[PDB]
Ligand binder design. Structure first.
Ligand SMILES: Nc1ncnc2c1ncn2[C@@H]1O[C@H](COP(=O)(O)OP(=O)(O)OP(=O)(O)O)[C@@H](O)[C@H]1O
Ligand SMILES: Nc1ncnc2c1ncn2[C@@H]1O[C@H](COP(=O)(O)OP(=O)(O)O)[C@@H](O)[C@H]1O
Ligand SMILES: Nc1ncnc2c1ncn2[C@@H]1O[C@H](COP(=O)(O)OP(=O)(O)O)[C@@H](O)[C@H]1O
Ligand SMILES: [Mg+2]
Lengths: 67, 1154, 192
């Protein structure tokens, strides 16, 4: 019954690839709960888009300067 | 003469340090050729320093140099980094050790000292006529190299170290090949044990076992091979009793492996079908061998669950082999699963389950020593990355024990580095880029982490880091199998039933005891029980008496009051069932120390001695002032008497010093390591320049609370690793004679990771009686000073029959700053003895009755001001009434005193005060009342008794006033004023004494003056705030000053001595807002005086004296002094009553307003 | 631009995603592993009944299980596939490594026994059935056959109970609580 509204009215859904492709912004923010990380989706998207990701974790001054 | 000797010793130490530094400099640059051209400016600086050192040496033979050398050490950082790059195992050595090993151009004996640091299982190198014959393991095993290494004079350390490293692998492979060929010839392993090293025999036996088991698996027969393995195990068990110690260790480890072989074959025999047998054989680890490889070191590979790993053929020695439990095999399987894709192995679960040991055993089975690191808060991103580039170049298997202890920022930051290492291993990258320098990546490296989640003060790994590790749960180990196999190996005739009884007893003790937080009865206590039962077979035999005695000696001291009865009942239910010299030595040590050997004290001393006999780290827990320090000091004295080994003790307070001062801190400006205090002590013990610590027992006592953040940095020290892993990479071993003591009052905040590692002694009640404590205190006070006649008078007057009822009556009083009456005896005894020794001058001109009455009056006064000195006026009156009734004796009243020997009162002691008009603004003026002179006299009497004084009372009561008024009329004491705040440190106290004291090396913090003592008046002592674990830095610092009489200097880790500095504290009631209760371990050392508000009549009299002094200016209104003062006092009282703290927080009124 | 990443709620959606993200027995084992991963990740959301705690299964576990399956199929060229070995390794080492409890290990082993039973006719869900590969198909033909099997599946409204083999009481409790929370939130959202 909860999903009936989505199945009835809205006839389209957007995944991460659709949001990245259909947005004019060059800056994106990703949020998730603890113990769930979605960087593999971004790596797969970069592989599909034939681009290169530079994975820079933050937390230290050396990584901040590198970033 | 003593000062001259101390100066000569300091000059000798400085000269020895300068000579060692110059010898290292001469070795690295001053002697070798073609080494001066790398850095020409540093070459010229080294030439100038060498010329200065030569001139100084010529002047001495006929400071600033050390400063210049230390300045040019920073110029040698790049050179040392390149030297570490040349031989990658130098990352485990310090800079001074690196200087020593490079500078040994022709000595070639300093490298055998650092074998243990660099290699982990080699303690020395066997030399023979300027050549290397072989290496010697830590356990004493001797490995002979295949070919002798020829050494020259121009050769330096790195290339001969590299060829020795390769020769060790070649020798291990050669011994393995010879042993495997001899086993293929058909001989039994009992003759092969006494020929080759343990690792070769282990690998050959494993290869033969897997080949024969696969042969038996080609068919469906296992009984013949199972019986053959059983006879082999019986043969090794028979050979165990008739072999040397080295062969004993070798046979024990082979027995572990053969018991695993027999277990696997027996499990395979009981399989119903072929598929179950095939699955079981695929699950267990198998040691195959390539027959077509032309490379020798890659010819043996290890298979488990399909995946393949390569044996490295690194020297292991004869390690303590672990019992093969099913959890161990599943852990090996998941480690192989993680390492197949070059990931990182990970184990998580509660402490004492076999995680670090499992990783080490996996490394040993894979033929390499696992280098284990103990992570800490100080491990920043740069330090951890330096450790990673140390272990990637070497190729060693790095285990990061306690990975939760890292900061969350560091855990997030090193995720890129760990992913880079994993990707470089997976894709075969030759060079990885870490810390902006391209370093080679050895294909043998791996990373392991063993976190312990679910504890306080531990971070959580981010998921982008946890996705790089394959974690496995290690919640429940199999203690039954471990106990059964260990008991079988040690020679116990009944092993299955005995191990089942041990495990059942431990389970029932865990289930039927009180729910205290320090009761952990897991795998570590079973290992301790077995390790204690191993020596006991000489005097008890391999049976049930041995295990019963071991269970008692391990578990009983850590139990409470009723838990001891539960232990005795359960030990009687499950199990069926001289020490004269040590007891005599203990009694002699107590007699020389002045203690009274009761049943409780002797029982605690026996428990301490028997538990330390096999345990290296101890915790002593009990009430404040229950007898912990006396216990371990008496036992150490008895140890020195009984064994003849001298004892050195280092009492360190853990929470007074910061971690950077305790362990150490890298200086980020120059990347230079600075030794802490415990690290400095350990390094001095390990180096042993003078040979003093060779045959002496070293005790390090941590006399403070068990902060997890402070103690879990020593996790690798406490457990079987016995290695202090520093951030810079140094691996300081713990000698067998180096023991660590933990003295604490509670275990509320400590973790099970610390309690389980250390043997624990619990003090349920005080170890001394009340009268025995009084007698010992009297003896100490007598020794601190006719004398024989006066000693009998005080002791006879201390009648215990009235004293016990006096103490019972005193227990009912209301005491501010609550201290047990067992702890207040020092004030009473020392004050009474000081008063007797003060009035001894006029004790030769009076009769015996007068002497008895004066002594009784002084003892009654001391008992009053000790037992009820921290109570209100009405309570003090009630207590003086009850001490008068509970003692013919001279009566002491509320104002009784002795003047110069006659008894008088305070009403005749009041001096007339006629203040001038202009003297009101002088802050040192005090109007003498009864309470003022009484408090002043008792404060001066307590301060002359060499005791700390804590003055308690409401604000504006007159604590600082009584301080200044008592100390103004004396030329023997100076006063320094320190006002504590919410955020006060030890550095503020030391800064307030920098202009008042002198540092003299006779170190000693003597007062600046020569005739006047110094009094440290600390105000608002409650104000310094607790940390997140509930401890005050300043309060423990002042407790250290009062009790131990000194402190450890943070920068040069040296001990000072406080000689003529007294401490007086001023505090408010703890019920006041913003005030916190201080620890009783500090308040135990200080006499407490309660200074209350003056009475309304007394306030009116004081301020009518003030108003008369004022109205001396206006003579026509001198008749209104009393109404004005009474009006002002009434106004103050009504303002105090009406406007309370409940309306506003700043509505605090005092006589300061008046 | 803000994107919140979370696991796909549906079971069939998870199977479709894991299948579209990718001899013939390797394809068959990958299909079975994708089904098993979807079922176990759907079971993880039921905190008090599906498991005894909150476990998170991610793409690394699927990658390791797939690598193990490929290694088993590569090293056993006799086509006597050790399904018991695969069951034990996946339920104990790959997916059961993080499992700290014992009943959860039992339910993971039962899920592996249901999915990786290696029978000719496998009823992984009450509607769909996965026949084993034949001896003359191709890789592309096998992929087409398995995606045709997946496409024809229609997920019933009680997939949290009928597909996971669970009693309906806890499923009804969980669904009722979630529906109540969402409906109350949108009721107080719609009133103003
Ligand atoms: N057997 C004994 N005979 C005489 N005096 C004893 C005996 N045992 C302990 N005492 C006395 O008990 C007092 C307090 O004991 P101790 O110094 O060992 O305290 P502690 O356990 O170190 O406490 P804290 O945490 O306050 O430092 C000492 O002054 C000591 O003289
Ligand atoms: N077969 C075995 N497996 C695991 N632990 C064992 C075995 N035999 C003995 N032990 C003992 O169990 C203890 C496990 O400690 P460990 O779990 O490694 O500490 P940590 O929890 O810090 O890693 C060790 O002291 C070791 O002596
Ligand atoms: N002879 C006296 N007897 C009692 N109280 C006095 C006498 N003379 C002054 N006082 C009051 O005692 C106060 C001293 O308070 P003070 O000691 O400074 O507070 P604290 O105890 O918090 O340091 C003075 O403000 C003064 O008003
Ligand atoms: Mg550990």
């Amino acid at each position: 019954a909860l999903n009936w509204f989505k199945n009835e009215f809205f006839v389209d859904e957007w995944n991460i690839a659709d949001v990245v492709a259909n947005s004019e912004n060059n800056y994106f923010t990703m949020a998730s709960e603890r113990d769930v990380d979605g960087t593999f989706k971004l790596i797969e998207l970069a592989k599909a888009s034939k681009e290169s990701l530079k994975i820079i974790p933050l937390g230290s001054i050396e990584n901040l300067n590198y970033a | 003469l003593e000062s001259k000797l101390t100066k000569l010793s300091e000059i000798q130490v400085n000269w020895v340090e300068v000579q060692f530094y110059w010898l290292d400099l001469y070795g690295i640059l001053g002697e070798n050729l073609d080494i001066q051209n790398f850095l020409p400016l540093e070459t010229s600086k080294f030439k100038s320093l060498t010329s200065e050192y030569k001139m100084i040496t010529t002047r001495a033979f006929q400071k600033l140099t050390i400063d210049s050398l230390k300045m040019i050490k920073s110029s040698l950082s790049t050179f040392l980094e390149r030297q570490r790059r040349q031989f990658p195992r130098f990352y485990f050595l310090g800079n001074d050790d690196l200087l020593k090993i490079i500078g040994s151009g022709k000595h070639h004996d300093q490298v055998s000292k650092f074998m243990k640091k660099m290699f982990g299982s080699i303690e020395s190198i066997i030399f023979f006529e300027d050549s290397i014959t072989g290496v010697r393991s830590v356990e004493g095993e001797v490995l002979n190299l295949n070919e002798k290494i020829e050494l020259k004079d121009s050769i330096q350390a790195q290339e001969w170290l590299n060829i020795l490293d390769t020769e060790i692998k070649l020798s291990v492979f050669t011994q393995f090949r010879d042993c495997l060929g001899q086993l293929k010839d058909g001989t039994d392993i009992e003759v092969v044990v006494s020929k080759y090293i343990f690792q070769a025999i282990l690998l050959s036996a494993q290869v033969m076992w897997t080949e024969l088991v696969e042969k038996c698996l080609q068919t469906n027969e296992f009984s013949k091979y199972w019986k053959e393995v059983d006879m082999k195990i019986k043969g090794l068990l028979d050979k165990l009793n008739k072999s040397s110690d080295n062969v004993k260790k070798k046979i024990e480890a082979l027995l572990v492996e053969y018991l695993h072989f027999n277990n696997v074959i027996g499990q395979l025999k009981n399989c119903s079908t072929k598929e179950e047998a095939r699955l079981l054989w695929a699950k267990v680890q198998k040691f195959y061998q390539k027959n077509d490889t032309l490379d020798d070191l890659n010819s043996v590979f290890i298979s488990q669950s399909g995946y393949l790993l390569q044996y490295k053929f690194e020297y292991i020695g004869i390690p303590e082999r672990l019992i093969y439990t099913p959890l161990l095999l599943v852990g090996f399987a998941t480690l192989t699963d993680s390492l197949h894709q070059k990931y990182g192995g990970c184990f998580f679960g509660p402490a004492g389950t076999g995680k670090t040991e499992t990783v080490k055993a996996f490394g040993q089975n894979l033929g390499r020593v696992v280098v284990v690191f103990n992570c800490d808060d100080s491990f920043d991103y740069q330090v951890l990355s330096r450790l990673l580039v140390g272990i990637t170049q070497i190729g060693a298997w790095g285990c990061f024990d306690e990975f939760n202890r890292l900061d969350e920022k560091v855990l997030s930051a090193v995720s890129a580095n760990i992913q880079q290492i994993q990707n470089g291993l997976q894709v075969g990258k030759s060079h990885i880029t870490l810390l902006e320098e391209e370093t080679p990546l050895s294909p043998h490296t791996a990373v392991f982490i063993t976190l312990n989640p679910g504890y306080n003060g531990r971070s959580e790994l981010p998921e982008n880091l946890k996705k790089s590790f394959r974690e496995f749960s290690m919640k429940s180990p199999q203690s039954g199998t471990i106990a059964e196999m260990i008991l079988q190996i040690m020679g116990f005739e009944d092993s299955k039933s005995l191990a089942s009884k041990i495990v059942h007893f431990l389970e029932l003790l865990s289930s039927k005891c009180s729910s205290m937080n320090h009761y952990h009865f897991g795998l570590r206590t079973l290992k301790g029980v077995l390790r204690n039962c191993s020596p006991l077979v000489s005097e008890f035999g391999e049976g049930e008496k041995t295990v019963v005695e071991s269970l008692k000696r391990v578990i009983l001291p850590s139990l409470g009051d009723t838990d001891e009865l539960v232990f005795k009942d359960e030990l009687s239910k499950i199990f069926d069932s001289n020490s004269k010299a040590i007891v005599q030595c203990l009694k002699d040590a107590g007699q020389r120390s002045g203690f009274s050997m009761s049943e409780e004290f002797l029982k605690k001393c026996m428990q301490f001695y028997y538990m330390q006999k096999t345990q290296q780290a101890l915790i002593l827990v009990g009430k404040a002032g229950c007898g912990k320090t006396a216990t371990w000091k008496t036992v150490i004295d008895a140890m020195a008497i009984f064994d003849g080994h001298a004892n050195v003790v280092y009492v360190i307070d853990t929470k007074v010093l910061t971690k950077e001062s305790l362990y150490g801190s890298m200086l980020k400006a120059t990347l230079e390591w600075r030794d802490g205090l415990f690290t400095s002590i350990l390094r001095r013990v390990n180096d042993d320049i003078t040979g003093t610590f060779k045959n002496s027992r070293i005790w390090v006592v941590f006399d403070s609370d068990l902060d997890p953040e402070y103690v879990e940095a020593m996790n690798s020290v406490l457990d079987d690793n016995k290695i202090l892993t520093l951030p810079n990479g140094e691996r300081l071993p713990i000698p067998p004679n180096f023991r660590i003591l933990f003295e604490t009052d509670n275990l509320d905040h400590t973790t099970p990771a610390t309690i389980t590692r250390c043997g624990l002694l619990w003090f349920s009640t005080d170890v001394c009686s009340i009268s025995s404590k009084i007698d010992h205190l009297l003896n100490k006070s007598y020794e601190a000073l006719e004398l024989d006649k006066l000693k009998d008078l005080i002791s006879d007057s201390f009648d215990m029959a009235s004293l016990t009822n006096i103490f019972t009556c005193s227990n009912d009083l209301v005491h501010i700053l609550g201290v047990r009456t067992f702890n207040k005896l020092e004030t009473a005894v020392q004050l009474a003895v000081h008063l007797i020794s003060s009035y001894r001058q006029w004790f030769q001109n009076l009769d015996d009755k007068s002497l008895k009455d004066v002594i009784t009056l002084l003892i009654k006064r001391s008992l009053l001001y000790a037992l009820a000195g921290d109570s209100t006026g009405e309570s003090q009156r009630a207590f003086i009434q009850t001490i008068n009734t509970y003692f013919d004796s001279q009566e002491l009243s509320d104002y009784s005193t002795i003047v110069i020997l006659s008894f008088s009162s305070f009403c005749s002691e009041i001096p007339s005060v006629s203040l001038e008009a202009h003297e009101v603004m002088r802050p040192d003026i005090v109007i003498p009342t009864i309470d003022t002179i009484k408090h002043e006299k008792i404060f001066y009497d307590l301060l002359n008794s060499k005791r700390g004084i804590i003055l308690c009372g409401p604000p504006g009561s007159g604590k600082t006033m009584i301080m200044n008024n008592a100390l103004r009329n004396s030329s023997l004491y100076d006063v320094v004023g320190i006002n504590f705040s919410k955020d006060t440190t030890t550095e503020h106290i030391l800064s307030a004494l920098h202009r008042h004291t002198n540092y003299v090396t006779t170190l000693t913090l003597l007062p600046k003056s020569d005739i006047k003592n110094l009094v440290l008046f600390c105000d608002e002592i409650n104000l310094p705030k607790l940390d997140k674990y509930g401890s005050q830095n300043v309060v423990l610092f002042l407790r250290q000053l009062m009790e131990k009489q000194g402190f450890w200097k943070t920068p040069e880790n040296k001990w000072v001595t406080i000689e003529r500095i007294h401490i007086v504290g001023a505090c408010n009631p703890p019920t006041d807002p913003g005030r916190i209760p201080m620890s009783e371990r500090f308040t135990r050392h200080a006499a407490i005086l309660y200074l209350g508000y003056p009475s309304g009549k007394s306030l009116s009299q004081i301020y009518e004296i003030y108003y008369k002094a004022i109205f001396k200016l206006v003579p026509e209104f001198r008749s209104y002094t009393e109404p004005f003062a009474r009006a002002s006092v009434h106004l103050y009282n009504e303002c105090k009553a009406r406007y309370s703290t409940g309306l506003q927080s700043h509505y605090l009124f005092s006589p300061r307003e008046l | 631009d803000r994107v919140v990443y979370e696991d796909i709620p549906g079971i069939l959606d998870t199977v479709k995603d894991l299948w579209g993200s990718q001899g013939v027995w390797s394809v068959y084992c990958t299909f079975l592993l994708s089904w098993f991963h979807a079922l176990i990740t759907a079971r993880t959301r039921l905190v008090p009944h599906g498991f005894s705690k909150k476990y998170y299964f991610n793409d690394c576990d699927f990658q390791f299980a797939s690598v193990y399956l490929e290694n088993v199929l590569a090293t056993n060229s006799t086509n006597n596939i050790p399904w018991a070995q695969v069951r034990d390794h996946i339920a104990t080492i790959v997916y059961g490594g993080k499992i700290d409890e014992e009943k959860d290990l039992e339910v993971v082993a039962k899920l592996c026994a249901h999915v990786f039973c290696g029978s000719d006719n496998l009823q992984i869900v009450p509607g769909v059935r996965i026949p084993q590969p034949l001896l003359q198909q191709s890789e592309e033909e096998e992929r087409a056959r398995l995606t045709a099997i997946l496409s024809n599946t229609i997920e019933p409204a009680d997939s949290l109970s009928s597909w996971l083999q669970l009693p309906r009481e806890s499923i009804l409790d969980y669904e009722r609580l979630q529906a109540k929370e969402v409906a109350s939130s949108t009721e107080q959202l719609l009133q103003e």
